[PDB]
Design an enzyme around this catalytic site. Structure first.
Site, PDB file in Angstrom:
ATOM      1  N   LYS A  17       0.827  -1.201   0.000  1.00  0.00           N
ATOM      2  CA  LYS A  17       0.000   0.000   0.000  1.00  0.00           C
ATOM      3  C   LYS A  17       0.865   1.255   0.000  1.00  0.00           C
ATOM      4  O   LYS A  17       0.549   2.238  -0.673  1.00  0.00           O
ATOM      5  CB  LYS A  17      -0.963  -0.010   1.184  1.00  0.00           C
ATOM      6  CG  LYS A  17      -2.067  -1.048   1.049  1.00  0.00           C
ATOM      7  CD  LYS A  17      -2.956  -1.085   2.278  1.00  0.00           C
ATOM      8  CE  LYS A  17      -4.227  -1.869   2.014  1.00  0.00           C
ATOM      9  NZ  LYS A  17      -3.954  -3.294   1.679  1.00  0.00           N
TER      10      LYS A  17
ATOM     11  N   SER B 116      -3.120  13.756  27.030  1.00  0.00           N
ATOM     12  CA  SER B 116      -2.228  14.516  26.158  1.00  0.00           C
ATOM     13  C   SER B 116      -1.670  15.765  26.842  1.00  0.00           C
ATOM     14  O   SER B 116      -0.577  16.221  26.517  1.00  0.00           O
ATOM     15  CB  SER B 116      -2.930  14.892  24.846  1.00  0.00           C
ATOM     16  OG  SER B 116      -4.087  15.673  25.086  1.00  0.00           O
TER      17      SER B 116
ATOM     18  N   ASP C 229      -8.401  14.951  30.872  1.00  0.00           N
ATOM     19  CA  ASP C 229      -8.401  13.727  31.660  1.00  0.00           C
ATOM     20  C   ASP C 229      -7.836  14.005  33.042  1.00  0.00           C
ATOM     21  O   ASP C 229      -6.699  14.465  33.172  1.00  0.00           O
ATOM     22  CB  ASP C 229      -7.574  12.654  30.955  1.00  0.00           C
ATOM     23  CG  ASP C 229      -8.031  12.424  29.528  1.00  0.00           C
ATOM     24  OD1 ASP C 229      -9.164  11.938  29.339  1.00  0.00           O
ATOM     25  OD2 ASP C 229      -7.270  12.746  28.600  1.00  0.00           O
TER      26      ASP C 229
ATOM     27  N   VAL D 109     -20.211  10.545  16.235  1.00  0.00           N
ATOM     28  CA  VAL D 109     -20.990  10.940  17.403  1.00  0.00           C
ATOM     29  C   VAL D 109     -20.580  10.107  18.615  1.00  0.00           C
ATOM     30  O   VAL D 109     -20.561   8.882  18.551  1.00  0.00           O
ATOM     31  CB  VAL D 109     -22.494  10.738  17.157  1.00  0.00           C
ATOM     32  CG1 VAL D 109     -23.297  11.191  18.370  1.00  0.00           C
ATOM     33  CG2 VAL D 109     -22.925  11.488  15.913  1.00  0.00           C
TER      34      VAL D 109
HETATM   35  N1  LIG Z   1      -4.132   0.916  28.080  1.00  0.00           N
HETATM   36  C1  LIG Z   1      -4.927   1.776  27.422  1.00  0.00           C
HETATM   37  N2  LIG Z   1      -4.950   3.077  27.829  1.00  0.00           N
HETATM   38  C2  LIG Z   1      -5.764   3.886  27.131  1.00  0.00           C
HETATM   39  C3  LIG Z   1      -6.553   3.487  26.056  1.00  0.00           C
HETATM   40  N3  LIG Z   1      -7.265   4.609  25.585  1.00  0.00           N
HETATM   41  C4  LIG Z   1      -6.899   5.643  26.367  1.00  0.00           C
HETATM   42  N4  LIG Z   1      -5.981   5.233  27.324  1.00  0.00           N
HETATM   43  C5  LIG Z   1      -5.343   6.036  28.353  1.00  0.00           C
HETATM   44  C6  LIG Z   1      -4.110   6.739  27.821  1.00  0.00           C
HETATM   45  C7  LIG Z   1      -4.602   8.083  27.470  1.00  0.00           C
HETATM   46  O1  LIG Z   1      -3.548   9.053  27.528  1.00  0.00           O
HETATM   47  C8  LIG Z   1      -5.625   8.339  28.505  1.00  0.00           C
HETATM   48  C9  LIG Z   1      -6.658   9.307  27.979  1.00  0.00           C
HETATM   49  O2  LIG Z   1      -7.213   8.838  26.741  1.00  0.00           O
HETATM   50  P1  LIG Z   1      -7.962   9.844  25.819  1.00  0.00           P
HETATM   51  O3  LIG Z   1      -8.419  11.119  26.599  1.00  0.00           O
HETATM   52  O4  LIG Z   1      -9.172   9.246  25.163  1.00  0.00           O
HETATM   53  C10 LIG Z   1      -6.784  10.274  24.541  1.00  0.00           C
HETATM   54  P2  LIG Z   1      -5.355  11.251  25.011  1.00  0.00           P
HETATM   55  O5  LIG Z   1      -4.101  10.432  25.005  1.00  0.00           O
HETATM   56  O6  LIG Z   1      -5.619  11.891  26.395  1.00  0.00           O
HETATM   57  O7  LIG Z   1      -5.249  12.447  23.984  1.00  0.00           O
HETATM   58  P3  LIG Z   1      -6.325  13.503  23.429  1.00  0.00           P
HETATM   59  O8  LIG Z   1      -6.773  13.080  22.058  1.00  0.00           O
HETATM   60  O9  LIG Z   1      -7.536  13.549  24.373  1.00  0.00           O
HETATM   61  O10 LIG Z   1      -5.659  14.956  23.353  1.00  0.00           O
HETATM   62  O11 LIG Z   1      -6.252   7.025  28.757  1.00  0.00           O
HETATM   63  C11 LIG Z   1      -6.506   2.120  25.654  1.00  0.00           C
HETATM   64  O12 LIG Z   1      -7.177   1.695  24.713  1.00  0.00           O
HETATM   65  N5  LIG Z   1      -5.664   1.299  26.382  1.00  0.00           N
HETATM   66 MG   LIG Z   2     -10.262  11.173  27.779  1.00  0.00          MG
HETATM   67 MG   LIG Z   3      -7.404  12.907  26.549  1.00  0.00          MG
HETATM   68 NA    NA Z   4     -18.649   7.385  18.282  1.00  0.00          NA
END
Ligand SMILES: Nc1nc2c(ncn2[C@H]2C[C@H](O)[C@@H](COP(=O)(O)CP(=O)(O)OP(=O)(O)O)O2)c(=O)[nH]1
Ligand SMILES: [Mg+2]
Ligand SMILES: [Mg+2]
Ligand code: NA
Length: 325
Positions: free
Chosen positions: A63, A171, A183, A94
């Site tokens: 790819k 993040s 978070d 959504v």
């Molecule tokens: N082990 C594991 N940890 C996870 C997973 N998904 C999230 N985490 C952990 C790690 C992750 O850092 C934390 C928050 O996940 P979000 O808020 O949804 C994505 P973020 O990285 O914060 O970035 P943003 O796009 O919001 O700016 O949960 C997963 O599938 N597996």
């Molecule tokens: Mg989150």
């Molecule tokens: Mg996050």
């Molecule tokens: Na969704």
DNA sequence: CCGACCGCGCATCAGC
DNA sequence: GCTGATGCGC
DNA sequence: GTCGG
């Protein structure tokens, strides 16, 4: 973004597999490949070169050769042209609508924002709020607003109980200049792996934040996890800020380091780190790291720092800012 | 070849 | 109700 | 879709 073109492609393929094909392993295979390529410090010149990387196999290599030669991927061109795939992909945008619900809605003749809005009674609570803030939730959050949000949460938590510790992870803790959401890790001395000497610990915090009109909506809520919506206050005559997603996770105070390692992410970094742990004979979750017996996970190992966790699996420590995979 | 793929909280559902 | 499985999400 | 053994 040395290889932005390639990683976007792989990400689009990952989303297709998750949303349309409902193939979770292909989805993660694509995300793994995208991630390893995203940190590769050279502009990729061929699929063979990319195939040298862990997670990139023969199919992805082909790819990549197609994409470099033509600037596109026929497989994706077709997918973009498929009404059903396009519909399902959109609906999954959504919050609360996943691959299954999306496909079900499309069957029932619900496939656009307009359709959703007139069939609100066909949505669960989570989905209703997701639709309600559909536009806002795709906006990024400048770090500057994240700082204001941090200030509010930390002060309001302090007001409920000075013994609470609230740490903004995700993040934000990795130093990103913008975040998709906020978070918040929460600990209180009354909640440990040994006992819960106090009820409503997460509740009281959500309540306070609602009381001051910071939290505006709830997507879900249990004893240890809250998922909802929040909004910064604006000034006189000022347009309002967008509503923002917020997640709050209450973790036993004595398991803070596994907790903060988990919540700091990124998600792919955790997945890779946990995969490595298994290869070293350990399993890691947000609570503990445990050895794997000849057979089953054993008893939790002593951990007194994030670094301790890295040590067990024989990885050199990596600062949060270097965990953005 | 082929089993295994990171680990888990909350919401919903089926079956008893 | 409960348990287990599934969906969705972190 | 990839890969370790
Ligand atoms: N082990 C594991 N940890 C996870 C997973 N998904 C999230 N985490 C952990 C790690 C992750 O850092 C934390 C928050 O996940 P979000 O808020 O949804 C994505 P973020 O990285 O914060 O970035 P943003 O796009 O919001 O700016 O949960 C997963 O599938 N597996
Ligand atoms: Mg989150
Ligand atoms: Mg996050
Ligand atoms: Na969704």
């Amino acid at each position: 973004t040395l290889n932005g073109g390639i990683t976007d492609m792989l990400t689009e393929l990952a989303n297709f597999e998750k949303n349309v094909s409902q193939a979770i392993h292909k989805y993660n295979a694509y995300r793994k490949a995208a991630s390893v390529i995203a940190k590769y410090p050279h502009k990729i010149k061929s699929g063979a070169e990319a195939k040298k990387l862990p997670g990139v196999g023969t199919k992805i290599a082909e790819k990549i050769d197609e994409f470099l030669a033509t600037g596109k991927l026929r497989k994706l061109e077709k997918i973009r042209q498929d009404d059903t795939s396009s519909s399902i992909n959109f609906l999954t945008r959504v919050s609360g609508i996943g691959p299954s619900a999306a496909r079900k809605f499309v069957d029932e003749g619900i496939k656009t924002l307009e359709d959703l809005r007139k069939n609100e009674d066909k949505l669960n609570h989570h989905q209703r709020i997701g639709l309600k803030y559909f536009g806002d939730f795709e906006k990024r959050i400048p770090r500057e607003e994240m700082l204001q949000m941090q200030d509010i949460v930390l002060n309001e938590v302090k007001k409920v109980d000075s013994e609470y510790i609230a740490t903004v992870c995700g993040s934000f803790r990795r130093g990103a200049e913008s975040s998709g959401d906020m978070d918040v890790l929460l600990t209180h001395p009354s909640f440990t792996s040994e006992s819960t000497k106090q009820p409503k610990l997460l509740h009281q915090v959500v309540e306070q934040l609602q009381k001051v009109h910071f939290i505006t909506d709830t997507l879900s809520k249990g004893e240890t996890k809250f998922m909802g919506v929040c909004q910064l206050p604006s000034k006189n005559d000022e347009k309002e800020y967008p509503h923002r997603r917020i997640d709050i996770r209450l973790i036993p105070k004595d398991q803070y380091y596994c907790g903060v390692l988990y919540f700091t992410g990124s998600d792919i970094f955790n997945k890779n780190m946990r995969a490595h742990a298994l290869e070293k004979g350990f399993t890691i979750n947000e609570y503990t790291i445990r050895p794997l017996g000849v057979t089953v996970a054993g008893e939790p190992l002593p951990v007194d720092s994030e670094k301790d966790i890295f040590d067990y699996i024989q990885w050199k420590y990596r600062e949060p800012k270097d965990r953005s995979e």
